[PDB]
Design a protein around this ligand. Structure first.
Ligand code: 32J
Ligand code: ADP
Ligand code: AMP
Ligand code: AMP
Ligand code: CL
Ligand code: CL
Ligand code: CL
Ligand code: CL
Ligand code: CL
Lengths: 159, 279, 362
């Protein structure tokens, strides 16, 4: 289906085109929006408007001038125009922030298993945390998720 | 039973939120064992920065080995351990006798892991995702079995484990001596016996971290009883395998002592044995 | 002479809302009524919201919850995109609370359970619907809540905060009115809190014609609790309307609350972060860059305080990415943060960070 919309005023607005043997199909008014939606065989179609006793084209829309001086609008209905994700894809063509308190909520500091840990907030995953370099060795740490499970890795690395 | 193991993936056994300690082979070895203790972990993977991959696993066995290999007396420092990197020891311990890294994938089956544990004769194995290359979790027999006990809804007749010429220590046996037994015999626990063949206690590889924890490792002359002062479990041959499997888990220990009427040793039954029988 | 899309005859415009007119649709043969959001392709590209619509569709298409408006189908045309959805006769909950007054304890609780259920389902799907108000809470014939404007919504990504200060100022959270970074769900709780206040009192907790006083009130989290309010619900409102997001109720804290729990149906439900340098922000960015390139790392300066950096591995011969971001901790101190970007990955990330630290301030 293709949307044909006239944006202006008028008492009676019609849509004439190749796809209807140039018969005056009427457009229904909402506000300053006159519409009729209809399916067109994906290809080339020429149309024109009969806005209140005057034959016009939509100047904003693409035109075609004839060997006979006929000035009509043109519509190249594409296959990509009908598939939503295809259409959307074709269409897509200071001071520092304050530290969110969330990044201070850890799981290592906060009877039971020392290997086990509390579940983390998505927001603090993949962030690097580290213990002070004590005795020329660095302790680095980060919580990451593999599938529906989490792993907090500590690296004892000298420097 | 084995059918269950061939279907279930390793991932299913990984806990929701775990801790993992990785040591760079460039780290001094004493700092490593101290970090095992401080983090509350029995085994940590080793990363070779130059090789850009995990080369192995540091365990309590490595501690038992450095200790025994390099102990002179309670009067001298174990200089070697004090100043030796994980790489410098791994090359000494495994000279011409070279060994790589045994590891499982999370998408690999539970069977494949149990088989690998026995195949390579190891008690702790790492799980590495092939995509990331990240170590996720370390598979311990106790865990594999605990999951099997949750799924389940005599000892003389079956005969599972080593029952003859068992490695044992006495009340007054020095820690060093015992460490040497853990080396030559390649076993995990040594039952402590009294004047008579009757068993009083059991000194395990795990009781050897207490030396590192309390920094009491420079004296290995101490009797095995003195060492165990920082703190039994028995089974018979008339007792059913399911009752024994239940007794092990409801105590979360690695093995049971096969004992006689008047507390006398007769054999042993480990988690490694039970998991071979059910494979 | 009827305008049709699907076999629905497009009728009266229901509202405009976030990204375009919503009209009624009555099926030619069945008389089944739908709500149709119209997105003009050329208009949606004028605001660069094409990415937003793409995501919004992707989400709402696989959602199926009894208190969130269902997205039946998306009909694309060369000119405009039509989002067909379930139609609810009762309209705005806002207009309901206007016409009839405040709801009795029992009826408010029923509706608050339904709304919160939906809000939860969203968050369980990593979706935070910012802009949660009774004007976006529609009612059906049987008086069921239906959450409906996902225009201002956003995804919750592992390791990231949101910034957009979206939604009405009365329903907006303090951190939002303050234009500060947020996780996402906490801002939906603060919004659900004011909805609960509106359901019980018939008025807004934070409202004044003077905007600066309205804004002080939101940040001072101070609101009036009339005498008719049950102290147990006052207790719940106090917990949801916390100015400290860290001190604010989580859907769990709410499910566990004695007032919420009542007559509830079954069908619903020492480490340091990075390194902290005290230099001037721009000096820190020069200091980090004169270190990143000193390490031969490829990068891209996004914000003046956000840097996406890459490293070519000399061994695995595989590129590893990480992003750096500088925040402000104090009136005096600032801290550089290190986040891991997915393409050992984790260990290679630690090594990357470490090198930078051995040549940097606190
Ligand atoms: N604003 C705006 C706007 C629109 O309104 C539309 C319509 C539209 C649909 C139906 C009617 C209609 C006509 C008569 C009576 C009842 C009716 O609902 C009017 C217009 C399209 Cl189609 S694409 C489009 N794009 C826009 O940007
Ligand atoms: N997955 C593995 N890959 C390579 N070597 C390993 C692996 N697991 C253990 N080792 C090595 O095998 C030996 C024995 O270790 P192990 O019996 O598993 O320790 P423990 O009994 O304390 O759990 C050690 O030298 C250790 O470094
Ligand atoms: N003290 C021991 N003496 C002899 N064999 C043992 C002893 N402890 C364990 N084993 C055996 O060693 C193997 C592996 O056991 P374990 O090292 O305890 O997990 C099994 O075949 C056990 O029967
Ligand atoms: N059969 C056993 N009886 C009593 N304690 C045991 C036994 N096996 C191991 N332990 C204890 O378990 C700890 C060592 O752990 P593990 O190597 O997992 O068994 C020590 O405190 C031992 O005393
Ligand atoms: Cl026009
Ligand atoms: Cl509106
Ligand atoms: Cl009607
Ligand atoms: Cl209805
Ligand atoms: Cl109101």
């Amino acid at each position: 289906p293709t949307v044909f919309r006239w944006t202006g005023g008028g008492k009676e607005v019609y849509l004439s085109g190749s796809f209807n043997n140039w018969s005056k199909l009427p457009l229904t008014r909402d506000q300053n929006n006159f519409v009729a939606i209809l399916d067109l065989p994906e290809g080339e179609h020429q149309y024109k408007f009969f806005v209140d006793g005057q034959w016009t084209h939509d100047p904003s829309e693409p035109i075609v001038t004839s060997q006979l001086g006929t000035v009509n609008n043109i519509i190249q209905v594409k296959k990509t125009d009908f598939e939503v994700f295809d259409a959307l894809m074709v269409d897509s063509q200071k001071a520092p922030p304050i530290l969110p308190p969330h990044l201070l909520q850890v799981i290592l500091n906060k009877s039971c298993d020392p290997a086990l840990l509390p579940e983390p907030n998505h927001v603090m995953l993949n962030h690097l945390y580290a213990l002070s370099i004590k005795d020329g060795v660095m302790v680095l740490s980060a919580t990451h998720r593999y599938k529906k499970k989490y792993v907090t890795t500590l690296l004892y690395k000298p420097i | 039973y084995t059918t269950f193991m061939k279907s279930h993936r390793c991932y299913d056994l990984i806990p929701t939120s775990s801790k993992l300690v990785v040591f760079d082979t460039s780290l001094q070895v004493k700092k490593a064992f101290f970090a095992l203790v401080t983090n509350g972990v029995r085994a940590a993977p080793l990363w070779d920065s130059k090789k850009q991959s995990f080369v192995g696993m540091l365990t309590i066995t490595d501690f038992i080995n450095i200790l025994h290999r390099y102990y002179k007396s309670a009067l001298v420092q174990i200089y070697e351990l004090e100043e030796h990197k994980i790489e410098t020891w791994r090359e000494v311990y495994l000279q011409d006798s070279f060994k790589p890294l045994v590891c499982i994938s999370p998408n690999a089956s539970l069977f494949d892991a149990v088989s690998s544990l026995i195949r390579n004769k190891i008690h702790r194995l790492p799980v590495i995702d092939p995509e990331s290359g990240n170590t996720l979790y370390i598979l311990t027999h106790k865990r594999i079995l605990k999951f099997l006990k949750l799924f389940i809804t005599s000892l003389e007749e079956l005969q599972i484990g080593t029952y003859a010429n068992i490695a044992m220590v006495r009340t007054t046996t020095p820690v060093y001596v015992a460490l040497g037994i853990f080396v030559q015999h390649r076993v995990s626990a040594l039952p402590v016996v009294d004047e008579k063949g009757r068993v009083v206690d059991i000194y395990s590889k795990f009781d050897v971290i207490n030396l590192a924890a309390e920094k009491t490792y420079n004296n290995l002359d101490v009797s095995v009883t003195k060492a165990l002062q920082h703190r039994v479990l028995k089974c018979y041959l008339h007792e059913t395998l399911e009752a024994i499997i239940n007794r092990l888990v409801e105590a979360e220990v690695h093995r049971l002592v096969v004992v006689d009427e008047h507390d006398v040793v007769k054999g042993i039954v480990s988690l490694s044995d039970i998991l071979q029988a059910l494979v | 002479g009827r305008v049709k899309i699907g076999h629905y005859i497009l009728g009266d415009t229901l509202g405009v809302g976030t990204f375009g007119k919503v009209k009624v649709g009555k099926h030619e043969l069945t008389g089944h009524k739908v709500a149709v959001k119209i997105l003009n392709r050329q208009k949606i590209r004028s605001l660069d919201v094409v990415g937003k619509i793409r995501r919004e569709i992707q989400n709402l298409k696989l959602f199926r919850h009894p208190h969130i408006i269902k997205l039946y189908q998306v009909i694309s045309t060369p000119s405009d995109i039509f989002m067909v959805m379930e139609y609810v006769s009762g309209g705005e909950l806002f207009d309901y609370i206007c016409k009839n007054g405040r709801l009795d304890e029992k009826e408010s609780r029923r509706l608050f359970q339904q709304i919160l259920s939906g809000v939860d389902y969203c968050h369980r799907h990593m979706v935070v619907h910012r802009d949660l108000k009774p004007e976006n809470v529609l009612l059906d014939a049987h008086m069921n809540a239906k959450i409906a404007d996902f225009g201002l919504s956003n995804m919750m990504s592992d390791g990231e905060f949101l910034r957009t200060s979206c939604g009405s100022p009365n329903y907006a959270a303090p951190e939002v009115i303050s234009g500060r970074l947020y996780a996402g769900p906490e801002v939906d709780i603060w919004s659900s809190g004011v909805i609960l206040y509106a359901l019980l009192c018939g008025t807004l907790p934070f409202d004044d014609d003077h905007v600066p006083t309205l804004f002080k009130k939101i940040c001072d989290g101070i609101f009036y609790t009339p005498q008719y309010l049950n102290p147990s619900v006052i207790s719940l409102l106090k917990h949801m309307l916390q100015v400290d997001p860290m001190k604010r109720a989580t859907i769990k804290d709410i499910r566990e609350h004695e007032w919420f729990k009542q007559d509830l149906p079954k069908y619903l439900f020492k480490w340091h972060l990075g390194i902290r340098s005290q230099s001037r922000p721009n000096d820190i960015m020069a200091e980090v860059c004169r270190a990143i390139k000193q390490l031969d790392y490829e990068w891209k300066v996004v914000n003046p305080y956000y840097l996406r950096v890459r490293r070519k591995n000399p061994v695995t011969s595989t590129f590893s990415k990480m992003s750096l971001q500088l925040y402000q901790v104090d009136s005096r101190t600032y801290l550089l943060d290190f986040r891991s970007i997915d393409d050992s990955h984790t260990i290679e990330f630690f090594e990357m960070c470490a090198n930078l630290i051995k040549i940097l301030a606190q």
